[PDB]
Design a protein around this nucleic acid. Structure first.
Ligand SMILES: CN[C@@H]1[C@@H](O)[C@@H](O[C@@H]2[C@@H](O)[C@H](O[C@H]3O[C@H](CN)CC[C@H]3N)[C@@H](N)C[C@H]2N)OC[C@]1(C)O
Ligand SMILES: CN[C@@H]1[C@@H](O)[C@@H](O[C@@H]2[C@@H](O)[C@H](O[C@H]3O[C@H](CN)CC[C@H]3N)[C@@H](N)C[C@H]2N)OC[C@]1(C)O
Ligand SMILES: [Mg+2]
Ligand SMILES: [Mg+2]
Ligand SMILES: [Mg+2]
Ligand SMILES: [Mg+2]
Ligand SMILES: [Mg+2]
Ligand SMILES: [Mg+2]
Ligand SMILES: [Mg+2]
Ligand SMILES: [Mg+2]
Ligand SMILES: [Mg+2]
Lengths: 129, 88, 218
RNA sequence: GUAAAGCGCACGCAGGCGGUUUGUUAAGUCAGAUGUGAAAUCCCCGGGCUCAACCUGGGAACUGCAUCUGAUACUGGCAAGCUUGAGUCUCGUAGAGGGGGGUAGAAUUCCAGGUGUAGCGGUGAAAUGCGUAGAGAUCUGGAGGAAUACCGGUGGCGAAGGCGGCCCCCUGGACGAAGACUGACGCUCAGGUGCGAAAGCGUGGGGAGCAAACAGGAUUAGAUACCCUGGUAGUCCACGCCGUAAACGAUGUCGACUUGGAGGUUGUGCCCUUGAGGCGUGGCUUCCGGAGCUAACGCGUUAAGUCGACCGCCUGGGGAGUAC
């Protein structure tokens, strides 16, 4: 069963990028949104909109540069049954910098680069390059 | 399965109100019925392993319910056991 | 839309999830081509032909299928273009070096038939070498005069002529083909969603592209 | 999946993992600081012996633990919900699903009598064998046990093993339809419990056909076989034991994503239903196959593709799944 909602969101994105799917939907949630946000603010998805009133959705549109998708590689990290918490000086550098590491800090869900400078650490989430 | 007459009947005696076959208490009771009633059948034949497999499921589920009831309301749980004389 | 309203979709329901994007809508046991999105491809594609066609653009028209065949000989020849409507030889594009040798053989053979150059040996040898030209011209003829790979390539259907396209893109040769439902667009770099056949559709674009090509020649 | 490796299959305690919202808490988590983490090593910068090895000043490091002060996204606790997960109720549908008891017809064999006469049976030929004490064939009647032709399928049910005449009784699951109901009660599961083809074992029944053993007859160089004539266990039944199999999809279970084509089975909705017809919307199931995966063969929305939760197992061949 859905023991890990995040993984689904992540997997759904890449599965689409390959199927050239315009966008993708799914049941939204606080975290799901936050993550999707950083994905847009960082340049991996055109935009996104959570539909549904009582039952929230998430119109997440996949972005594509040229003859290929923007998301070349995206995987989970701090998955359940095996969490991962790094220090303000442990934050990993995805794709030597050309990538991003979504980390949940005590100040919100930001990126490794951002969080690092801010001087705060947190729990990684994925390595969207 | 169980007889509609006996079904609705028991559904009311434990139903939190009028027509609510969803209530936990109801289920437990509804199950216990088919349970104590089926034993008679199982007392005979015995080798009806296939039908036995089902019986056990009702048991396990009943347990998973009674346990839940207690984990979310030690009150109803304790009282529920009474009218059903279960869990020793 | 004018002549456009004379071919629409085709191919019952075998289709291909790749053409789906260019497909209009299904009906009477068969989907139709979304001409509405085909119009842009109609011009845009040809707009790229006149360009390189400006300098004796080596435009190779491909169409082995029965219908197109008897047509390509005209339209594809009624301008500085090349036509191929008889069993696309294996490698006549990529294996030119070896294939051209065949063309030369065909050349001299013509000179023989030309004047008193074929009058040799009894009717035996005559017929022996005469029939040789026939077949040789059927395949090489429509390209005999081209001592160099084509600048472009316009094939009718991207299916029956699959071999042709495969070589082109392999050598880096822009291909323009009419892909419809049961066609594979991944190959051709210039999509032309239109009836793979249709006596009208075939001639329509054939002459249509011809002009846009002859015009580019200043 | 085929190289070593998915427990034969289920239920399930501990354990691991847990949909969604608000609040709350601040334990994990992150930040700061303070202790402490011996000196020496190591490392960086710099000194001293002619250099080097070596010696030395300072710092870094000692990624560890504890306390104090914060931060609150995420995980955890608590409070309150919610409904898509899971489950309940109502009405049906298809089914070789299971346990029990009946009962029908086809055939085999055997017994009894009629008719009838020199063969029958068998093989590649034969022979053993059965026949004038009358077989075989044919007919009539009776006894008995085992299994259900056709329907029957590229079909259905089941967790697995497996499950076929028909009728009844007891009983499990699955699926659909509208709604109504509980409110995460879930997923997996070491150990554990139960189910387990055939063969085998115990007691007691049964015993037609088939048939290890065994006995003849052939074959052959031999023939402790294949073939033939016989035939005991057993095969059948009841209750108990035994737990293995190429227990095989050689592919663990739950959930979510990912182009298509063709065929079967089963529920429901809607249609000029005028009809087979056609148009939807669920379950299960075959064949082909794209991307991708793979060492290849091939798998391919029922994955061996893309991912997550949990468990099981592999670590060269022989010795050995043997010894103890
Ligand atoms: C008469 N046809 C039946 C059909 O009605 C249906 O019936 C079976 C029935 O035959 C079974 O009974 C069978 O098995 C019993 C032991 N388990 C002993 C009696 C025997 N007939 C029942 N246990 C289950 C029904 N669904 O499935 C099997 C069948 C043979 O096709
Ligand atoms: C894609 N192949 C399909 C195969 O999957 C199957 O499809 C059935 C289809 O026949 C049924 O259709 C049935 O119900 C229709 C009204 N709803 C009328 C036709 C009837 N056969 C559908 N209800 C369910 C599909 N899975 O049978 C037909 C087919 C062409 O071979
Ligand atoms: Mg092997
Ligand atoms: Mg193996
Ligand atoms: Mg298995
Ligand atoms: Mg020290
Ligand atoms: Mg919390
Ligand atoms: Mg099944
Ligand atoms: Mg047995
Ligand atoms: Mg016995
Ligand atoms: Mg396949």
């Amino acid at each position: 069963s859905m023991q890990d909602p995040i993984a689904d969101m992540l997997t759904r994105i890449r599965n689409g990028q390959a199927a050239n799917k315009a966008a993708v939907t799914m049941p939204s949630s606080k975290l799901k949104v936050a993550i999707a946000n950083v994905l847009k603010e960082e340049g991996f998805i055109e935009d996104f909109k959570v539909e549904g009133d009582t039952k929230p959705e998430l119109e997440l549109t996949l972005k594509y540069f040229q003859g290929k998708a923007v998301v070349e590689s995206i995987q989970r990290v701090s998955r359940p049954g095996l969490r991962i918490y790094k220090r303000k000086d442990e934050l990993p550098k995805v794709m030597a910098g050309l990538g991003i590491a979504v980390v949940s800090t005590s100040k919100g869900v930001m990126t490794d680069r951002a969080a690092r400078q801010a001087g705060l650490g947190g729990e990684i989430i994925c390595y969207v390059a | 399965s169980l007889s509609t007459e006996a079904t609705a009947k028991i559904v009311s005696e434990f139903g939190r109100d009028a027509n609510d076959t969803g209530s936990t208490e109801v289920q437990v009771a509804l199950l216990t019925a088919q349970i104590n009633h089926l034993q008679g059948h199982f007392a005979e034949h015995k080798k009806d392993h296939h039908s036995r497999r089902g019986l056990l499921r009702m048991v396990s589920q009943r347990r998973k319910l009674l346990d839940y009831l207690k984990r979310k309301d030690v009150a109803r749980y304790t009282q529920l056991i009474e009218r059903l004389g279960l869990r020793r | 839309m004018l002549k456009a309203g004379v071919h629409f979709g085709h191919q019952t329901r075998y289709w291909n999830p790749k053409m789906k994007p260019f497909i209009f809508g299904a009906r009477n046991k068969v989907h139709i081509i979304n001409l509405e999105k085909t119009v842009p491809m109609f011009n845009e594609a040809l707009a790229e032909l006149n360009k390189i066609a400006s300098r004796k653009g080596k435009i190779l028209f491909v169409g082995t299928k029965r219908a197109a065949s008897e047509a390509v000989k005209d339209a594809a020849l009624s301008c500085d273009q090349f036509f191929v409507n008889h069993r696309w030889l294996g490698g006549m594009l990529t294996n030119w070096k070896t294939v051209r040798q065949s063309i030369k053989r065909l050349k001299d053979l013509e000179t023989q038939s030309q004047d008193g150059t074929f009058d040799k040996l009894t009717k035996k040898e005559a017929l022996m070498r005469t029939r040789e030209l026939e077949k040789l011209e059927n395949s090489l003829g429509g390209i005999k005069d081209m001592g160099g790979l084509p600048d472009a390539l316009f094939v009718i259907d991207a299916d029956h002529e699959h071999i042709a396209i495969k070589e082109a893109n392999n050598l880096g040769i822009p291909v323009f083909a009419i892909v419809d439902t049961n066609s594979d667009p991944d190959g051709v770099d210039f999509v032309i969603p239109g009836n793979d056949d249709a006596i009208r559709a075939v001639t329509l674009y054939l002459g249509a592209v011809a002009a846009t090509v002859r015009e580019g020649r200043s």
